[PDB]
Amino acid sequence: PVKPNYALKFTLAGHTKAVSSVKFSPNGEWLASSSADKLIKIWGAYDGKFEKTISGHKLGISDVAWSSDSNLLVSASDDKTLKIWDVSSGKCLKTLKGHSNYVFCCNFNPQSNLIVSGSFDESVRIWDVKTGKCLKTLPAHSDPVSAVHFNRDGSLIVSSSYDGLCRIWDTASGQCLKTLIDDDNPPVSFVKFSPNGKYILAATLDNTLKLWDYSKGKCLKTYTGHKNEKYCIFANFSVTGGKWIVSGSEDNLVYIWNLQTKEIVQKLQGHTDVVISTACHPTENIIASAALENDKTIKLWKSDC
Ligand SMILES: CN1CCc2cc(-c3cn4c(n3)CCC4)ccc21
Ligand SMILES: CN1CCc2cc(-c3cn4c(n3)CCC4)ccc21
C-alpha cells in the first residue's frame, strides 16, 4: 500500500482531565489509558467498550505500560512513584519508590521481569518486578527524562531528555554505551527503538522526528510537517500494514508518514486539543490517539491497509 486510509471508528470518553498515554495490550484485546485525573482506564481494543477503572495514585499519571503477557500494567505518576497493577483484579501489587520527583515514563522489558523508568529528577531507574526494588539508578541526564524504552531482547535501554541527548544503556551493567549528538541538540521529547532494534526514533521540540542508526550514530531519516514545540508526544512504528511513522501533533492532528520516503501519507482529523499520545495495534491496522485537557477523548481509527 502506498497510502493507508485510517478512518474514525470509536471515540472513548471517560477521563475528566487530559489523557497522557494510551497503549495496546500485547495480546491485542485491550487499550490502557492514563490521565491527569489520576486514573487508569481499560477499554476494548476492537469495540472501544469501556471495561474498568484502576485507581490508587495520589497525583496525575504520565505513562502506563503493559507486561508482555498482558496481565500487568505499570504506571508512572507525579506522586513520584510507579505502581505495578494486576489488571484482572485491579490490585496494586507493588509501589516502586525511589525517584525524588515526577515519574514521567515507564516500560517493561520483553521478559517483563524488569521495569525501566525516567523522571523529572533526571535519573533513569531499573526495577525488579517481583520484588519491587530498585536495582540500578543511572545518572542518565542533566535535565528531565522524557522517555525510556527497552530494545527487542531487553539488553539495551534508550533514554531521552530535555538536555538534548539520547543515550543507550546496557541493562545488565548500567553503563552508558552511546550518546547521540546531532549537529544541534534541541530538547528530545520522545525516543523508542525500532521493532528490529537497529534504529531509534527520536522526537525533538523543533517540530522534527528523526530515525537514527544509533550504532553508527547517524541520522537516516527526518520527518516534518507536524507541530511539536512544547509537549512530549509519543511516536510509533506502524508495521501491521504499510510501514509508517505515526505521531500526535500540537495542531490536534494525528500524522502518518511513509517511513522510507518521509512523505506525509495521512493526517487524521477529529481531536479538539493537542494529540499527546498515539499507539499502534500489534496485529490489526488500528491506531489509538488521545488528547489533552480541552478534548479529553481517546479515538480508535482503522485502515484497510
Ligand atoms: C497532562 N500532561 C500534559 C502533557 C503531557 C505529556 C506526557 C508524556 C509522558 N510521556 C510522553 N509524554 C512521551 C514519553 C512518556 C504525560 C502527561 C502530560
Ligand atoms: C520530560 N520533562 C520535560 C519538562 C517536564 C515537566 C513535568 C511536570 C509535570 N508536572 C509539572 N511539571 C507540574 C505539575 C505536574 C514532567 C516531566 C517533564
Swiss-Prot record:
Its main location: nucleus. The modification N6-acetyllysine is found at residue 83. Changing residue 104 to A: Strongly reduced affinity for histone H3. Significant decrease in interaction with KMT2A. One of its GO terms (molecular function) is histone H3K4me1 reader activity. The keyword Transmembrane helix does not apply. One of its GO terms (cellular component) is MLL1/2 complex. Changing residue 260 to A: Reduced interaction with RBBP5 and reduced ability to stimulate KMT2A methyltransferase activity in association with RBBP5 and ASH2L. It is found in: Nucleus. Changing residue 104 to L: Strongly reduced affinity for histone H3. Changing residue 292 to A: Abolishes histone H3 binding. GO terms for biological process: gluconeogenesis; negative regulation of transcription by RNA polymerase II; positive regulation of DNA-templated transcription; positive regulation of gluconeogenesis; regulation of cell cycle; regulation of cell division; regulation of DNA-templated transcription; regulation of embryonic development. InterPro entries: G-protein_beta_WD-40_rep, WD40/YVTN_repeat-like_dom_sf, WD40_repeat_CS, WD40_repeat_dom_sf, WD40_rpt. Keywords: Acetylation, Chromatin regulator, Host-virus interaction, Isopeptide bond, Nucleus, Repeat, Transcription, Transcription regulation, Ubl conjugation, WD repeat. Pfam families: Beta-prop_WDR5. There is a cross-link at residue 17 (Glycyl lysine isopeptide (Lys-Gly) (interchain with G-Cter in SUMO2)). WD repeats lie at residues 14-53, 56-97, 99-139, 140-179, 183-224, 227-267, 270-304. The keyword Magnesium does not apply. Changing residue 62 to F: Strongly reduced affinity for histone H3. Changing residue 179 to M: Found in a patient with childhood apraxia of speech; uncertain significance. Contributes to histone modification. May position the N-terminus of histone H3 for efficient trimethylation at 'Lys-4'. As part of the MLL1/MLL complex it is involved in methylation and dimethylation at 'Lys-4' of histone H3. H3 'Lys-4' methylation represents a specific tag for epigenetic transcriptional activation. As part of the NSL complex it may be involved in acetylation of nucleosomal histone H4 on several lysine residues. May regulate osteoblasts differentiation. Belongs to the WD repeat WDR5/wds family. This is WD repeat-containing protein 5. It comes from Homo sapiens. The gene is WDR5.
